[PDB]
Write an enzyme that holds these catalytic residues in place. Structure first.
Site, short mmCIF file in Angstrom:
data_model
loop_
_atom_site.label_atom_id
_atom_site.label_comp_id
_atom_site.label_asym_id
_atom_site.label_seq_id
_atom_site.Cartn_x
_atom_site.Cartn_y
_atom_site.Cartn_z
N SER A 36 0.86 -1.18 0.00
CA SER A 36 0.00 0.00 0.00
C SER A 36 0.89 1.23 0.00
CB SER A 36 -0.93 0.01 1.21
OG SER A 36 -1.74 1.17 1.23
N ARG A 37 0.83 2.01 -1.08
CA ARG A 37 1.72 3.16 -1.22
C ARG A 37 1.29 4.34 -0.37
NH1 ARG A 37 3.85 3.23 -7.56
NH2 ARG A 37 3.91 0.95 -7.79
N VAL A 38 0.06 4.35 0.14
CA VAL A 38 -0.35 5.40 1.05
C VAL A 38 0.36 5.25 2.39
CG1 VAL A 38 -2.31 6.44 2.24
CG2 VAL A 38 -2.56 5.65 -0.12
#
Ligand SMILES: Nc1ncnc2c1ncn2[C@@H]1O[C@H](COP(=O)(O)OP(=O)(O)OP(=O)(O)O)[C@@H](O)[C@H]1O
Ligand SMILES: [Mg+2]
Lengths: 146, 489
Positions: free
Chosen positions: A117-119
């Site tokens: 998850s890049r967030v």
């Protein structure tokens, strides 16, 4: 409609793999030059403009949002396919469900190694932040030692 | 009512393979319309065409159901006033039909009450059914790992000569004969001798009582048939099944063999229609054709249709577009592997690549679900260990890994079963294992209470009792050999 009026929505696409097939059929029947795997040349742009419409509006525009959960199918855990790669290069993350884990009794078969998850922790509640931060390190050490 | 285009006269404008273009002065009839060639042409059989495209306001591209030999340009063609229609009702029971619905069994006239077009709209959302059950087939692997659902869609994926036909015949014997409702056998691009064998088997078992009441219909378009008929025999058979389901509210069994030839015929005709091929070389409308055909094979609120379809995998490439697209249209999937067959394990089902929809504790019993999951986990772990075993050796494993390997080998041997139809090839009497017996035997084997039993005792047997009897016979033979060796001293 809800995003532009200060509300939050979740959109689920089940699944973009078949939309690509439909678009390829339409393009080929209408005499469009085929591309990779017979797909039309502008097959990336299709999903690219589809998924760019899901955003988190600024407070000045209401603060509504749309969350996208596109679904994509692979063959024999081959993530090197054409449309699969295009979708992976567009979304902000990926939940990779592994067949071996699914048959091994792990359900949901979330492959934590191949998932990202890049967030990051920005999308976590304050209560979950510390637990997840320590859990990630513990799991990484466990996988390395195991 | 009468169609407004019946009797319309057209002339053949172009002939290429099985694709013929017809020009109508007064206007091309609607797509899917059936046309008949009136010119004698010195042919031995009549010629029928189905409109599939409109080139312009007057010209229409059609596909021929028979060979287009001795077909000249300007040949007169007359519209039939509607699509291709086939007989329906109880009058069709016990008969053999072709793509056009003509009786090919050389018996009396069908005398059907009415006919219906092969092309029809699939059931809508409001008509879908919400009934889940378990169909006991008597086969340990299917009943355990991928149980079949009554009124569901089933598929058998396999290469050439892997056992697809044998499994279909076993299912027919174990279900259709003892089936209350009707059955429809649709042969699509298969051997003609197999149709004769099935017809003889049905007649012998009184499933088709020509002198009484039959409960089966045979519709056959085989390999010899041109691509036109192999792309519509399935539609005709499914139309008969739909009539039985809806107009009578009767449970129907639809055995399709082979469904891959339908897509292959569609690809062959598409190549001539002048369409850009998709990947591999299939028609761009591969998914749409399968969707239209399969969506009609479903159980509605009026009746039920349990469909068993054989899917051929060319070159054993399971990633081919044709078999690959079929997975999403099936409730139960049975994947057969050539390597498994070469090891003497029949059926060659690959349990790790198989799946079922009713593998749910809310549908099947809790014990059944737990046993199936445990078996799958054991097989998965054994497959993982085989990678190490095939390189270094069995002796390079942990102490418990050896136990897992032994149990998994016994499971793999135990999954095999001799079918009552393969007695010639197996040379052994077939077995019919009850669902409860399979669950009990596998649950016991997992616990480890049968660790002393020899591994080969599980090979080609029925339930646990058969395993124990074979183990007893093997023990007696071994004791005799040991006695002979000892007496030699
Ligand atoms: N259950 C079985 N037990 C023993 N032998 C089997 C079994 N299934 C298949 N075989 C063997 O495999 C051969 C081919 O089987 P089958 O007729 O089912 O092929 P298939 O899957 O229909 O392939 P294709 O139709 O493309 O030739 C049989 O003649 C038999 O020798
Ligand atoms: Mg066969």
């Amino acid at each position: 409609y809800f995003m532009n009026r200060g509300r939050h929505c979740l959109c689920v696409y089940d699944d973009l793999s078949k939309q690509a097939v439909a678009y390829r059929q339409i393009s080929l029947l209408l005499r469009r030059p085929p591309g990779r795997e017979a797909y039309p040349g502008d097959v990336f742009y299709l999903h690219s403009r589809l998924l760019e419409r899901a955003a988190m509006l600024s407070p000045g525009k209401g603060g509504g949002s749309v969350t996208a959960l596109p679904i994509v199918e692979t063959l024999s855990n081959d993530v090197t396919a054409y449309i699969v790669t295009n979708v992976i290069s567009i979304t902000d993350g990926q939940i990779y469900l592994d067949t071996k884990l699914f048959t091994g009794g792990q359900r949901p078969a979330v492959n934590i190694g191949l998932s990202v998850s890049r967030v990051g922790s920005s999308a976590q509640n304050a209560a979950m932040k510390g637990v997840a931060g320590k859990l990630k390190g513990i799991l990484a050490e466990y996988r390395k030692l195991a | 009512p009468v169609a407004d285009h019946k009797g319309r006269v057209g002339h053949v404008s172009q002939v290429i393979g099985a694709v013929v273009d017809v020009h109508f002065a007064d206007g091309v009839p609607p797509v899917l319309t059936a046309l008949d060639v009136v010119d004698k042409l010195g042919r031995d059989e009549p010629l029928t065409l189905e409109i599939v495209q409109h080139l312009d306001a007057h010209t229409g591209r059609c596909i021929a159901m028979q060979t287009t030999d001795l077909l000249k340009l300007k040949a007169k063609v007359v519209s039939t006033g509607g699509n291709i229609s086939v007989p329906v009702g109880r009058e069709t029971l016990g008969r053999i039909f072709n793509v056009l619905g003509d009786a090919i069994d050389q018996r009396g006239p069908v005398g059907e009450k009415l006919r219906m077009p092969i092309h029809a709209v699939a059931p809508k959302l409001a008509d879908q059914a919400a009934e889940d059950a378990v169909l006991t087939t008597g086969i340990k692997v299917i009943d355990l790992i991928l149980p079949y659902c009554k009124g569901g869609k089933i598929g058998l994926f396999g290469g050439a000569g892997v056992g697809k036909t044998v499994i279909i015949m076993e299912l027919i014997n174990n279900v259709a004969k003892g089936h209350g409702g009707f059955s429809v056998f649709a042969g699509v691009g298969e051997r003609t001798r197999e149709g004769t064998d099935l017809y003889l088997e049905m007649m012998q078992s009184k499933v088709i009582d020509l002198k009484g009441e039959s409960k089966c219909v045979l519709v056959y378009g085989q390999m010899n048939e041109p691509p036109g008929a192999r792309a519509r025999v399935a539609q005709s058979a499914l139309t008969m099944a739909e009539y039985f389901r809806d107009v009578e509210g009767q449970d129907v069994l639809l055995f399709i063999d082979n469904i891959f030839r339908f897509t292959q015929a569609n690809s062959e005709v598409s190549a001539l229609l002048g369409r850009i091929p998709a990947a591999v070389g299939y028609q761009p409308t591969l998914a749409e054709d399968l969707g239209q055909l399969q969506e009609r094979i479903t159980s509605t609120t009026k009746g039920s249709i349990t469909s068993v379809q054989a899917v051929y995998v060319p070159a054993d490439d399971i990633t081919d577009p044709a078999p690959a697209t079929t997975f999403s249209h099936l409730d139960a999937t049975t994947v057969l592997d050539r390597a498994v067959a070469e090891s003497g394990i029949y059926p060659a089902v690959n349990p790790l690549e198989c799946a079922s929809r009713i593998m749910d504790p809310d549908v099947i019993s809790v014990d059944h679900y737990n046993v199936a999951q445990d078996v799958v986990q054991m097989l998965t772990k054994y497959r993982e260990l085989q990678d190490i075993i095939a390189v270094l050796g069995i002796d390079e494993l942990s102490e418990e890994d050896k136990l897992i390997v032994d149990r998994a080998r016994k499971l793999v041997k135990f999954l095999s079963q001799p079918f009552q139809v393969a007695e010639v090839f197996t040379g052994m009497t077939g077995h019919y294992v009850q669902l409860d017996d399979t669950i009990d035997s596998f649950s016991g084997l997992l616990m480890g209470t049968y660790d002393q039993v020899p591994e080969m005792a599980f090979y080609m047997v029925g339930g646990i009792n058969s395993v124990l009897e074979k183990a007893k016979k093997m023990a007696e033979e071994a004791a005799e050999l040991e006695k002979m060796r000892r007496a030699r001293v």
